[PDB]
C-alpha cells in the first residue's frame, strides 16, 4: 500500500513543523477532528492514525498500540506530537467487583489513554444514546421506544459489561456479535435476560462456555457501581449490543399496534451499519459537551495540543 513506515513517519516528524496527534484508528481520527473543530473550526492540528502506518513485522502489522509505543519510545521528549491509545481492560480490577484504578485520563509524555475501554465508551452517556437512537429511528413509535429504552438503560449496562467480560475471559471478543441476536433478548422491568437459544450455527461447546462465563460473571457486575460499570464495555461489542437491545425494545413495545410494522422497523434497525451508529453517537457526544456536566472528553489532550 501507499503509506509511511515507522522510520518514514519519524523522519516526517523531523521534517514537519506542525502540531500532530497519533491515534489508533481512523474512526478516532474522525471523532477527534469533529471534537477539535467544535472548539476551533479553523484549527490547524493534523491527526495521524497508527492504522495507516506500515509495519515490516507480521505481529506488529496489525498492532496499532505497538506502533504507537515504538514511535513514542524513539521520539520520547518531543513537544509537537501527542499519542492516543485505547486503555482496553488495563488498570481494571476484577476482584469480584469492577474497580477503576485510574478514574482519570492517563498521561505519560504525550501518550494518553481513554478513560473507558475505548473511545466509544464516551458515547455510553444515556443522553447521547437517547439523542442518537431518536435521531436514527424508523419514526413510527420512537417516543415510546425511547422511553422504554431510557428505563432499561440503567440496568442494561450490567448486562453489557457481563457480556464483554465473558467475551474477554474466553478471549472471543467478537463472539457475542454474531452469536446473540435481538430476538433472543427479552424486555423485563428494566432488565434483560438473553435466553440460551437451543439452535445456533456455531458449535454448542462455544455457546455453552459463553453462557457459563456470562452466568458466572453477571452477579459480580451487579454488585459494582453503575458509573464504573459503563466504562468497561467493549466498544465494538457495545455498539452492536445497543443496536440489538434497541431493536428488541422497539419491537417489544410496538408489536401491539402492528406486529408486521414493528418487525419491519426492528429488522431495519438491526440491519443498520456500525459506521452510521458510531458517527451518530460521535455527533451527539460532540453536541452534548458543555450542556451536560456528565459528558466527558479528553480535555487534557486538547489542552496539551
Amino acid at each position: 500500500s501507499c503509506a509511511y513506515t515507522i522510520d518514514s513517519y519519524i523522519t516526517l516528524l523531523t521534517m514537519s513543523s506542525k502540531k500532530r496527534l497519533l491515534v489508533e484508528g481512523r474512526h478516532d481520527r474522525s471523532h477527534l477532528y469533529q471534537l477539535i473543530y467544535k472548539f476551533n473550526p479553523a484549527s490547524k492540528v493534523k491527526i495521524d492514525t497508527a492504522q495507516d502506518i506500515k509495519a515490516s513485522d507480521k505481529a506488529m502489522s496489525k498492532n496499532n498500540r505497538l506502533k504507537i509505543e515504538t514511535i513514542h519510545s524513539k521520539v520520547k521528549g518531543k513537544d509537537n506530537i501527542s499519542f492516543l491509545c485505547d486503555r482496553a481492560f488495563r488498570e481494571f480490577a476484577f476482584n469480584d467487583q469492577i474497580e477503576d484504578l485510574l478514574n482519570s485520563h492517563y498521561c505519560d509524555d504525550s501518550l494518553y489513554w481513554t478513560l473507558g475501554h475505548s473511545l466509544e465508551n464516551y458515547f455510553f452517556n444515556p443522553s447521547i444514546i437517547i439523542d442518537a437512537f431518536q435521531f436514527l429511528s424508523p419514526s413510527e413509535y420512537k417516543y415510546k421506544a425511547i422511553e422504554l429504552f431510557s428505563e432499561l438503560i440503567s440496568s442494561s449496562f450490567a448486562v453489557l459489561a457481563a457480556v464483554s467480560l465473558a467475551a474477554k475471559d474466553i478471549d472471543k471478543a467478537g463472539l457475542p456479535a454474531a452469536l446473540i441476536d435481538w430476538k433472543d433478548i427479552v424486555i423485563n422491568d428494566g432488565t434483560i435476560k438473553l435466553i440460551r437459544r437451543d439452535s445456533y450455527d456455531i458449535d454448542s461447546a462455544c455457546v455453552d462456555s459463553f453462557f457459563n462465563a456470562f452466568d458466572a460473571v453477571l452477579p459480580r457486575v451487579i454488585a459494582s457501581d453503575v458509573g464504573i460499570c459503563s466504562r468497561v464495555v467493549r466498544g465494538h461489542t457495545g455498539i452492536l449490543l445497543l443496536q440489538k437491545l434497541f431493536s428488541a425494545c422497539l419491537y417489544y413495545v410496538g408489536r401491539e399496534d402492528d406486529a408486521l410494522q414493528a418487525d419491519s422497523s426492528a429488522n431495519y434497525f438491526c440491519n443498520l451499519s456500525e459506521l452510521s451508529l458510531t458517527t451518530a453517537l460521535a455527533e451527539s457526544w460532540v453536541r452534548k459537551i458543555g450542556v451536560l456536566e456528565d459528558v466527558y472528553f479528553p480535555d487534557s489532550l486538547l489542552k496539551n495540543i
Binding site: 501507499c2 509511511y4 516526517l12 521534517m15 514537519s16 513543523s17 506542525k18 481512523r26 495521524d48 495507516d52
Partner: protein, 410 residues
C-alpha cells in the same frame, strides 16, 4: 453532469489487463512502479476528450468505459489483413471505424492543416455529443513545461506545446489542457473586469433604486453607519470611491445641529449593506481562491491592486514590507499549488482533473493541506489523482484505489 464510473481494459500493450471502477468525486490511485497508472491517465484523457485518433498509437484489444449516466463506450483495436483498424462503438449503437495508417498519415500531414479524418471524427463526436465534459491532464513534468512556455500557451491555442510534448513523450500523449499560471493571471484579470462591470451595473441599479426607498419614507444606526463607512473606505474594491466617512460625519453633524428621517436612515443603511453584500458576492470566488492560496504563503500574499489613475488592475504578490511582485517570482511548488488550486476552483471550466504525481516539488506540509483546500471549494468536478505520497491521500482513504495489472503469458 456526466462522470466516469467504470473502466475495463483488455491487453494494454499486450502485456497487462486492468479493470478499475471509479468514483464521481475523487479517485486516488496508488501503486508500484510501471503499473500503468500514467497509461491509464492517458487512456482516460483520450476517452473523455473524444480524441480517439490517439488510440492508433496504443496497443490494446478492447477498452470499455462506463459513465455514471449509463453511457458505455467500447473501443476495439483489430488487425484485419495486416491492416490495423480502430473501432469505437457507443452504448446507443452508434459506431465509427478508421484506419491506423490513415490516422498516422493525418498526423504526418499535421506535422508536415485540418484533414478529412479529423473533420470526420469531429462530426462523429458532434452528432453523438461525446465531448460534453473535458479532462484536465496534469503531467508530472508540467513545471518544466510551464517553464518552457514562459521562457520563449492558452487552452484554445496550445499547438506548439502539444507538438513539443508529443515529440518528447510519444504521439499517444493527449492535448495539453491544464491551465498555465500566465493563463491563471489572465483569467484573474478577466474575472476582475467581470466583477468590476457587475459592480458598475449594481451601482447604476442602486442609484436608480435608492430614490424609491427615499420616497417610501437611532444611536445604534449611527455606529453601524460609521463602521460600514470605515470598512468601505478601507477596502480594496472601493479604490475608485472611498469617501463615505465624510458623508457619515456630515450626516451626523446635520442630525445633531437641529419619522421619515429615520426611514431615510434605515433605507440608506439597507442600501449600504446591500452594496457591501453585492461586493462580497461578486468577489467571493476570487477571495476564496486567494484565501486558499495565502494559507500556504508565508512571507507574501497574492493580492489584486487597483489604481484610481491606472485603470489596469495589478495582480501579484504583496509583501509585508510593501513590495509588489508578479507571479513569476514564485517558486516551482508555489506555482504547482496555484495551478492545482485553480484546477479545483469554480473559475475553471468543467473538466476531469487528471493529475499524475501532484506532490512534485511540494513541501510535506502543503501536501497534507492541498486536497483539503481543493475539496473545500465545492467545485463538483471529478478528480483522478495518481500519487505515491501518502501525505497527499490522507483523510480520503475510502477513495484510494490500488492498480493490480494482470500479466498475460505469450
Amino acid at each position: 453532469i456526466r462522470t466516469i464510473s467504470k473502466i475495463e481494459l483488455s491487453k494494454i500493450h499486450n502485456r497487462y489487463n486492468l479493470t478499475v471502477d471509479f468514483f464521481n468525486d475523487l479517485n486516488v490511485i496508488h501503486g508500484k512502479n510501471g503499473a500503468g497508472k500514467s497509461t491509464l491517465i492517458h487512456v482516460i484523457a483520450n476517452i473523455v476528450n473524444g480524441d480517439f485518433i490517439r488510440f492508433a498509437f496504443l496497443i490494446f484489444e478492447e477498452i470499455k468505459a462506463t459513465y455514471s449516466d449509463g453511457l458505455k463506450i467500447v473501443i476495439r483495436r483489430d488487425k484485419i489483413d495486416e491492416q490495423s483498424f480502430i473501432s469505437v462503438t457507443l452504448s446507443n449503437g452508434k459506431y465509427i471505424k478508421f484506419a491506423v495508417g490513415e490516422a498516422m498519415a493525418t498526423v504526418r500531414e499535421i506535422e508536415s492543416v485540418k484533414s478529412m479524418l479529423a473533420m470526420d471524427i469531429d462530426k462523429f463526436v458532434k452528432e453523438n455529443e461525446l465531448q460534453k465534459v473535458r479532462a484536465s491532464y496534469f503531467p508530472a513534468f508540467r513545471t518544466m513545461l510551464e517553464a518552457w512556455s514562459s521562457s520563449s500557451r492558452s487552452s484554445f491555442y496550445n499547438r506548439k506545446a502539444s507538438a513539443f510534448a508529443r515529440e518528447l513523450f510519444g504521439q499517444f500523449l493527449p492535448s495539453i489542457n491544464y491551465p498555465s499560471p500566465m493563463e491563471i493571471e489572465d483569467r484573474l484579470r478577466e474575472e476582475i473586469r467581470r466583477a468590476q462591470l457587475g459592480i458598475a451595473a449594481y451601482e447604476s441599479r442602486t442609484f436608480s433604486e435608492s430614490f424609491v426607498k427615499v420616497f417610501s419614507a437611532t444611536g445604534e444606526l449611527l455606529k453601524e453607519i460609521e463602521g460600514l463607512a470605515i470598512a468601505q473606505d478601507s477596502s480594496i474594491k472601493n479604490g475608485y470611491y472611498a469617501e463615505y466617512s465624510k458623508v457619515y460625519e456630515e450626516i451626523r453633524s446635520l442630525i445633531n445641529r437641529n419619522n421619515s428621517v429615520s426611514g431615510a436612515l434605515v433605507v440608506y443603511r439597507d442600501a449600504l449593506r446591500d452594496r457591501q453584500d453585492y461586493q462580497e458576492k461578486a468577489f467571493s470566488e476570487i477571495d476564496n481562491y486567494m484565501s486558499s492560496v495565502n494559507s500556504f504563503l508565508e512571507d507574501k500574499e497574492m493580492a489584486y491592486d487597483f489604481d484610481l489613475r491606472r485603470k489596469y488592475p495589478k495582480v501579484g504578490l504583496k509583501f509585508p514590507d510593501g513590495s509588489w511582485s508578479p507571479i513569476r517570482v514564485l517558486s516551482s511548488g508555489e506555482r504547482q499549488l496555484l495551478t492545482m488550486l485553480y484546477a479545483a476552483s469554480k473559475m475553471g471550466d468543467d473538466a476531469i482533473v487528471l493529475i499524475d504525481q501532484p506532490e512534485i516539488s511540494l513541501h510535506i506540509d502543503w501536501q497534507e493541506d492541498l486536497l483539503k483546500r481543493m475539496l473545500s471549494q465545492l467545485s463538483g468536478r471529478q478528480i483522478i489523482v495518481c500519487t505515491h505520497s501518502p501525505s497527499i491521500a490522507t483523510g480520503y482513504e475510502d477513495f484510494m484505489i490500488n492498480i493490480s495489472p494482470e500479466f498475460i503469458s505469450s
